Design an enzyme around this catalytic site. Structure first.
Site, PDB file in Angstrom:
ATOM      1  N   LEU A  30       0.806  -1.073  -0.004  1.00  0.00           N
ATOM      2  CA  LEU A  30      -0.202  -0.038  -0.044  1.00  0.00           C
ATOM      3  C   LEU A  30       0.877   1.326   0.073  1.00  0.00           C
ATOM      4  CD1 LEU A  30      -2.516  -1.222   2.689  1.00  0.00           C
ATOM      5  CD2 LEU A  30      -2.954  -0.985   0.253  1.00  0.00           C
ATOM      6  N   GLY A  31       1.990   1.347   0.880  1.00  0.00           N
ATOM      7  CA  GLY A  31       2.940   2.351   0.610  1.00  0.00           C
ATOM      8  C   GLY A  31       4.164   1.825   0.808  1.00  0.00           C
ATOM      9  N   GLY A  33       8.578   3.055   1.293  1.00  0.00           N
ATOM     10  CA  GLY A  33       9.581   4.300   1.224  1.00  0.00           C
ATOM     11  C   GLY A  33      11.030   3.928   1.732  1.00  0.00           C
ATOM     12  N   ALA A  34      11.822   4.615   2.556  1.00  0.00           N
ATOM     13  CA  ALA A  34      13.244   4.241   2.405  1.00  0.00           C
ATOM     14  C   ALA A  34      13.291   3.523   4.027  1.00  0.00           C
ATOM     15  CB  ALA A  34      13.960   5.817   3.147  1.00  0.00           C
ATOM     16  N   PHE A  35      12.093   3.550   4.600  1.00  0.00           N
ATOM     17  CA  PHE A  35      12.298   2.876   5.917  1.00  0.00           C
ATOM     18  C   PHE A  35      11.569   1.481   6.082  1.00  0.00           C
ATOM     19  CE2 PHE A  35      13.010   7.254   8.000  1.00  0.00           C
ATOM     20  CZ  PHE A  35      14.399   7.309   7.689  1.00  0.00           C
ATOM     21  N   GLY A  36      10.611   1.503   5.152  1.00  0.00           N
ATOM     22  CA  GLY A  36       9.678   0.078   5.470  1.00  0.00           C
ATOM     23  C   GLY A  36       8.720   0.224   4.406  1.00  0.00           C
ATOM     24  N   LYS A  37       7.465  -0.453   4.757  1.00  0.00           N
ATOM     25  CA  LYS A  37       6.479  -0.704   3.913  1.00  0.00           C
ATOM     26  C   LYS A  37       5.166  -0.865   4.539  1.00  0.00           C
ATOM     27  CE  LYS A  37       7.618  -4.809   2.241  1.00  0.00           C
ATOM     28  NZ  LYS A  37       7.075  -6.185   2.996  1.00  0.00           N
ATOM     29  N   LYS A  58       2.219  -2.492   9.162  1.00  0.00           N
ATOM     30  CA  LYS A  58       3.427  -1.425   8.861  1.00  0.00           C
ATOM     31  C   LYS A  58       4.551  -2.237   9.503  1.00  0.00           C
ATOM     32  CE  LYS A  58       4.557   3.300   9.836  1.00  0.00           C
ATOM     33  NZ  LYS A  58       4.234   4.463  10.223  1.00  0.00           N
ATOM     34  N   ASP A 158       2.058  15.654   9.891  1.00  0.00           N
ATOM     35  CA  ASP A 158       2.089  15.487   8.344  1.00  0.00           C
ATOM     36  C   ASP A 158       0.501  15.531   8.121  1.00  0.00           C
ATOM     37  OD1 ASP A 158       2.851  15.393   5.707  1.00  0.00           O
ATOM     38  OD2 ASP A 158       3.635  13.108   5.962  1.00  0.00           O
ATOM     39  N   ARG A 162      -3.279  13.579   1.269  1.00  0.00           N
ATOM     40  CA  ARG A 162      -2.739  12.145   0.979  1.00  0.00           C
ATOM     41  C   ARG A 162      -2.528  11.261   2.393  1.00  0.00           C
ATOM     42  NH1 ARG A 162       1.243  16.353   1.087  1.00  0.00           N
ATOM     43  NH2 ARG A 162       2.255  16.056   2.960  1.00  0.00           N
ATOM     44  N   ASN A 163      -2.851  11.749   3.751  1.00  0.00           N
ATOM     45  CA  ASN A 163      -2.891  11.195   4.880  1.00  0.00           C
ATOM     46  C   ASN A 163      -4.236  10.915   5.473  1.00  0.00           C
ATOM     47  OD1 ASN A 163       0.011  10.188   4.812  1.00  0.00           O
ATOM     48  ND2 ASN A 163       0.697  12.105   5.638  1.00  0.00           N
ATOM     49  N   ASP A 176      -1.273   7.339   9.195  1.00  0.00           N
ATOM     50  CA  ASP A 176       0.192   7.644   9.338  1.00  0.00           C
ATOM     51  C   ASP A 176       0.670   8.405  10.631  1.00  0.00           C
ATOM     52  OD1 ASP A 176       2.872   8.029   8.952  1.00  0.00           O
ATOM     53  OD2 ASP A 176       2.742   8.210   6.860  1.00  0.00           O
TER      54      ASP A 176
END
Ligand SMILES: CC(=O)N[C@@](C)(c1ccc(F)cc1)c1cnc(N2CCN(c3ncnn4cc(-c5cnn(C)c5)cc34)CC2)nc1
Length: 297
Positions: A30-31, A33-37, A58, A158, A162-163, A176
């Site tokens: 679903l999403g 990034g640099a640190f995980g998904k 997550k 944030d 989008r969130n 998030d």
């Protein structure tokens, strides 16, 4: 000191959340990034012993530094402290024994509101047509969720379309919580990190001084409202993030009203973008304002 503010991230993990990781079946991402998904998954027996339900999970990458591992546990602990609310993506469980920490949350079947608005833009009505009534409802629900966070002395940091996710029944949920913080002790948070930042959603004092407060979340809510009533347009069109952008914001430049924003909703936007954080409304006040608008519709 004999009295203190209880830091929810210092509290023990409550094993009431623990779920067996062998009962999760991972699906699509679903999403990422640099640190995980975050992945869609089926959770077998999570709420009812004999039923499977779809959840979001997550997780960090195996190479994640300890800064990211503790941040995930801290997010789990903040969600545990906050408790349940209709307008947030709620915690359902976690897998913490031995293997990588997994945080299990509600799955929102329609995805994020920004992409939803853009898909529905061309058939919007000022059948399954997006209408002004939908936009007012979404504005109300996000204000209610944010009022809830603020009532627990938490900031999100944030907030953006989008969130916000959409699920059954036209229910919107804030998602998030990776940067969410309890700020009970100092009434603000000074970000010392060095990640990419959502500049066009940030209050000026967050850009210039790295300070985050209840009032900077309210600024971002105003930007969210502009995205919402613009049916998903990017903020500050034609203005890249550069020296001129910061100068214009500091000097008082603000976006004009979206075509489809009711006058009283643009009024909220303008107050959310007051350069003086003390003149911005609270989420509690915003909820009451939108309530009055809906009842007079
Ligand atoms: C900076 C960074 O690395 N962030 C990382 C990459 C991150 C990841 C792991 C980590 F440990 C630390 C950070 C990040 C963090 N959150 C997220 N999401 C927020 C939660 N979310 C959802 N939740 C619940 N239901 N749902 C349904 C949909 C959906 C999509 N289409 N349709 C039809 C439905 C989407 C979601 C979506 C994305 N995505 C990446």
């Amino acid at each position: 000191n004999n009295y203190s503010y209880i830091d929810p991230t210092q509290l023990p993990y409550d094993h009431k959340w623990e779920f067996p990781r062998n009962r999760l079946s991972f699906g699509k991402t679903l999403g990422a990034g640099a640190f995980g998904k975050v992945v869609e998954a089926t959770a077998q027996g999570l709420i009812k012993s004999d039923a499977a339900m779809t959840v979001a999970v997550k997780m960090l990458k195996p190479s994640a530094h300890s800064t990211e591992r503790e941040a995930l546990m801290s997010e789990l602990k903040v969600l545990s402290y906050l408790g349940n609310h209709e307008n947030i993506v709620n915690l359902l469980g976690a897998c913490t024994h031995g293997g990588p920490t997994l945080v299990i949350t509600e799955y929102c079947c329609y995805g994020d509101l920004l992409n939803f608005l853009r898909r529905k833009r061309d058939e919007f009505v000022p059948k399954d047509f997006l209408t002004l009534e939908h936009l007012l409802s979404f504005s109300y629900q996000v204000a209610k969720g944010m009022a809830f966070l603020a009532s627990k002395n938490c900031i999100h940091r944030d907030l953006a379309a989008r969130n916000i996710l959409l699920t059954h029944g036209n229910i919107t949920k804030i998602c998030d919580f990776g940067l969410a913080r309890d700020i009970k002790n100092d009434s603000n948070y000074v970000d010392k990190g060095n990640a990419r930042l959502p500049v066009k959603w940030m209050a000026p004092e967050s850009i210039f001084n790295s300070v985050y407060t209840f009032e900077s979340d309210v600024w971002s809510y105003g930007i969210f409202l502009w995205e919402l009533f613009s049916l998903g347009s990017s903020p500050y069109p034609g203005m890249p993030v550069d020296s001129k952008f910061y100068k214009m914001i500091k000097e008082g430049f603000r976006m004009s009203s979206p075509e489809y924003a009711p006058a009283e909703m643009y009024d909220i936007m303008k107050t959310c973008w007051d350069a003086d954080p003390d003149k911005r409304p609270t989420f509690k006040q915003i909820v009451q304002d939108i309530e009055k608008q809906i009842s007079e519709s």
